[PDB]
Design a protein around this ligand. Structure first.
Ligand SMILES: [Cl-]
Ligand SMILES: [Cl-]
Ligand code: NA
Ligand code: NA
Lengths: 300, 300
């Protein structure tokens, strides 16, 4: 029993973290085989942070301008290239600790673990979800850029996120490992703000199913709902729309617990109306939306 | 910025995890130097007296797998509730480490494992009732808890059982239980738990550092006055050493501990009036003062 935000074991990623330095700027890089991936804004200078022309800034660099340190070993950069907002540094040594890995671009609501690092050194690991507004609610300080987000289902590290910046509300924004930002953000210090965030309905329902599995039923009711009536209500609480894909996805948990998906939807509707009345669900007094249906099955 | 429940990077401990099988029982072991540590209840029962069951066992009754590799057991002894299996090979991945026993209220990371394979990492506090609110299914026994200071891993916890309330109990790595528990299938209950006052205060300081300030007021109180409130709300007593430990956070925010205690009083008496702190609608008590300092400053 029990239910917590569980990260994946971080060791396979720890052995890939390096420090990249350009001028006065140091951040983290990800060393897989003979390439180091990092945010391209490492080549920015204080002068042009509003409208950097990355192509012009990169053509001016030589390989020996990039200082890359893996622990106490300096790696030798033998080439470089930019892919979207990621810089790829070719190095003279393939990382002998490279795990089996792939690069995946995730959708909003998906979860992953972040290995927060500074100066190439891991600090901590935690779980995060990609919010509907394409931000993440992380824990980063300056120098954490290049820290990555990943899953390790089965045999194999799936890299899904690289950290690039912090938005004025205290939330965080970055790219996939092909260097495409999540959301409408750009790697410039021009004024930018996250869209209004919303709650990840399908994940809240998963977590209510987790609660039933863990043996708690107090929030159920004798009612059902149509999908459309559920969405009409839940939108008034800034919940994301629930789709037929989401209903399908919850099928397994529905079967495991014997509670129909749309009946659980009716329980959620009533929770939004009543609140908790001094009770908790899996130790929370809020409805939790950073566990996916897949996570619930993985942990329960 | 941001503030998350953060576990230590787990790779140093991942390379110490092995599978131990003996009889019908499979669970996890910790391989350090040439010894595998695991719960003594792995030994085959016939209400046990674990010494007599252990002479019946031959070294080759303990099957120890390190990944896809068998470790040869060449000896076995008991220390309190922990079995120590001498093996023929020192773990080449052994980190700098020591065995420590933690106090109630202190936090640590748990590397949850199944069949010797790390599955997940999360951060826990040793509760005042000497239990931990973990996430464990059958076969997690022998998973460990630890902190990291510099490069040194301090192992503090080994998992032995789940209690009827869904919380978990175990020992230090020297086999001494935390709490009034014994390792057998019997009528055992966690004592009434209480809230870790010094940690709630630390988390309110973390909130203030992250810009959450609505709960601050102009008022201050006395240790004796507050402890009467604490006692009423099933909060642990606050001691002068707790106040002194929070010194750094009081200096950094300009809110003296007894100033903050007056805030906690009002929160206890009046609730949070529909508001949240650091994304929580409850008062969170599994961050220590050191945890807040460490995360609001970036150690690796
Ligand atoms: Cl996805
Ligand atoms: Cl909460
Ligand atoms: Na292993
Ligand atoms: Na006050």
């Amino acid at each position: 029993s029990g239910f917590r935000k569980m990260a994946f074991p971080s060791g396979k990623v720890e052995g890939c973290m390096v420090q990249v330095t350009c001028g006065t700027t140091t951040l983290n890089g990800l060393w897989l085989d003979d390439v180091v991936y990092c945010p391209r804004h490492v080549i920015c200078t204080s002068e042009d942070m509003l409208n950097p022309n990355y192509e012009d800034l990169l053509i001016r660099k030589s390989n020996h301008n990039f200082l890359v340190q893996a622990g106490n070993v300096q790696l030798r950069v033998i080439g470089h290239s930019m892919q979207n907002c990621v810089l790829k540094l070719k190095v003279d040594t393939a990382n002998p600790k490279t795990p089996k890995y792939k690069f995946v671009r995730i959708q909003p609501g998906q979860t992953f673990s972040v290995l927060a690092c500074y100066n190439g050194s891991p600090s901590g690991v935690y779980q995060c979800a990609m919010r509907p507004n394409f931000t993440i609610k992380g824990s980063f300080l300056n120098g954490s850029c290049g820290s990555v987000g990943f899953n390790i289902d089965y045999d194999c590290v799936s890299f899904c996120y690289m950290h690039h910046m912090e938005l004025p509300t205290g939330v965080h924004a970055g790219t996939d490992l092909e260097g495409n930002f999540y959301g409408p953000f750009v790697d410039r210090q021009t004024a930018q703000a996250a869209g209004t965030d919303t709650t990840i309905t399908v994940n809240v329902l998963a977590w209510l199913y987790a609660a039933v599995i863990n043996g708690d039923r107090w929030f159920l009711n004798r009612f059902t709902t149509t999908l459309n009536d559920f969405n009409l209500v839940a939108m008034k609480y800034n919940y994301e729309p629930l789709t037929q894909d989401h209903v399908d996805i919850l099928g397994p948990l529905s079967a495991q617990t014997g509670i129909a998906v749309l009946d659980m939807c009716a329980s959620l509707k009533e929770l939004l109306q009543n609140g908790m009345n001094g009770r908790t669900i899996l130790g929370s007094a809020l409805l939790e939306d950073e566990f996916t249906p897949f996570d619930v099955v993985r942990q329960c």
